[PDB]
């Protein structure tokens, strides 16, 4: 039968270990699980499998664009802030808004700003002018886990546009992740 513990009478100091799926009941009530969709939208793989805006850059020259990729404190991706460590594939969505040209895109977890000066083997995919691509950067990190908060939690993204004439433009970037491994959930964030 039902114990008084499952009827509401408990002790907060006896909750450890963390993660106790204890059932709560009372007459005329029982946990009822009803599904509306064929699958879950709470699963990490599904939720995060959907991109979210990151930032935009307006180029004028053929200079390079180096930016510390990090988890959002803004979109639905904020749900990541509930975790401390991450590891797995990273999907980067880049939109190359230009009349005539090409956009070199690369990604690395390497902090050194000189290993990027060349782009030899940092994944120089080419998005023709007015096009957009979605490259999935592997976990080529030198650290087993990525603190989820760091201003560079995610590796740096590089964008060296190869323009042809006076043409200029802007590169909007949004991103998601493929199968994410989050660990050791931390306390909920505050609001600004």
């Amino acid at each position: 039968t039902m114990s008084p513990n499952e009827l509401g009478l408990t002790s907060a100091q006896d909750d450890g270990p963390l993660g106790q799926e204890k059932p709560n009941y009372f007459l005329n009530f029982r946990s009822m699980n009803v599904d509306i969709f064929t699958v879950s939208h709470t699963k990490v793989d599904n939720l995060f499998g959907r991109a979210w805006f990151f930032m935009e850059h307006t180029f004028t020259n053929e200079g390079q664009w180096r930016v510390p990729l990090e988890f959002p404190k803004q979109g639905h991706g904020s749900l990541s802030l509930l975790f401390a460590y991450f590891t797995g594939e990273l999907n980067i969505h880049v939109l190359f808004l230009s009349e005539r040209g090409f956009l070199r895109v690369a990604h690395t977890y390497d902090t050194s700003n000189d290993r990027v000066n060349f782009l030899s083997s940092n994944g120089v995919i080419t998005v023709p002018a007015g096009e957009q691509m979605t490259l999935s950067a592997p976990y080529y990190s030198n650290k087993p886990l990525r603190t989820v908060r760091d201003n560079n939690s995610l590796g740096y993204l590089m964008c060296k546009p190869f323009l042809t004439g006076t043409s200029t433009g802007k590169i909007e970037v949004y991103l998601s992740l493929r199968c994410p491994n989050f660990f050791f959930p931390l306390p909920a964030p505050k609001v600004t």
């Binding site: 114990s3 408990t10 002790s11 100091q13 450890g16 007459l27």
Partner: protein, 257 residues
């Protein structure tokens, strides 16, 4: 007999006065989560007694193996443990030419020499224990060019010998674990010495358990052109180590009577 029956004297009554709509009340009685118990926890030489314990906690689906499966540190897991038994340089003196036979080249305070400086692998632990019981493995090294010749006596002298050293006849020291090592023939001597004393344990940081010495069997015959600076080095390893008596940090404690 009473004082707990609150569950089946309310759960049943309703179950007895229930209609097609079922019982209109359910009552369950049991013991509180915070029961009258006592918990005891023991770590190395420690015991924590608590009479008001609480449910222990821990992270989600935790892994306490504590072993890095990637081995970011390629070493044996027991490296830190065995570290203090590691081979180390105990001494290095210079064989000054023109030293008659029997002359003592260099000595070494056993076993406190393994904690000779704070830079000794064993120095760390040695400080938290007053008693010691260990075995030794010495390797006295002496290098000399082929042109030169000579011989040194590497011998282990227990406290008994060290005490009455002058009363003993040199040339008979070959009765003790030694290595008459003829230069120009051998560059290193090996000596395996077990725990030797008149007491089960020796006070840490003591000269007890004897000491290893190196004498001049036959003085160095160094030709004219040949070099004249021969160095004698004493290396030591602990075949087996054992620190028992706990004590304050490096405080002289008397295990003896």
């Amino acid at each position: 007999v009473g004082n707990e029956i609150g569950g089946n004297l309310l759960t049943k009554v309703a179950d007895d006065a229930s209609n097609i709509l079922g019982p209109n009340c359910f009552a369950t009685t049991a013991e509180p989560e915070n029961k009258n118990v006592v918990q005891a926890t023991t770590t190395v030489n420690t015991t924590n007694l608590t009479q008001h314990p609480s449910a222990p906690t821990m992270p989600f689906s935790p892994d306490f193996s504590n072993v890095d499966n990637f081995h970011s540190m390629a070493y044996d897991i027991t490296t830190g443990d065995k570290n203090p038994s590691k081979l180390v340089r105990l001494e290095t003196h210079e064989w000054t030419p023109s030293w008659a036979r029997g002359y003592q080249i260099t000595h070494v305070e056993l076993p406190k020499v393994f904690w000779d400086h704070q830079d000794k692998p064993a120095y760390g632990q040695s400080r938290y224990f007053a008693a010691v019981r260990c075995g030794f493995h010495f390797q006295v090294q002496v290098n000399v060019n082929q042109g030169t010749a000579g011989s040194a006596l590497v011998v282990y002298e227990p406290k008994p010998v060290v005490t009455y050293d002058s009363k003993l006849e040199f040339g008979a020291f070959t009765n003790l674990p030694h290595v008459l090592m003829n230069l120009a023939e051998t560059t290193q001597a090996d000596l395996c010495i077990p725990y030797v004393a008149d007491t089960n344990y020796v006070k840490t940081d003591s000269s007890d358990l004897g000491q290893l010495k190196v004498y001049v069997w036959t003085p160095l015959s160094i030709p004219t052109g040949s070099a004249n600076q021969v160095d004698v080095t004493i290396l030591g390893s602990l075949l087996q180590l054992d620190f028992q008596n706990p004590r304050v940090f490096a405080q002289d404690v008397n295990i003896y009577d």
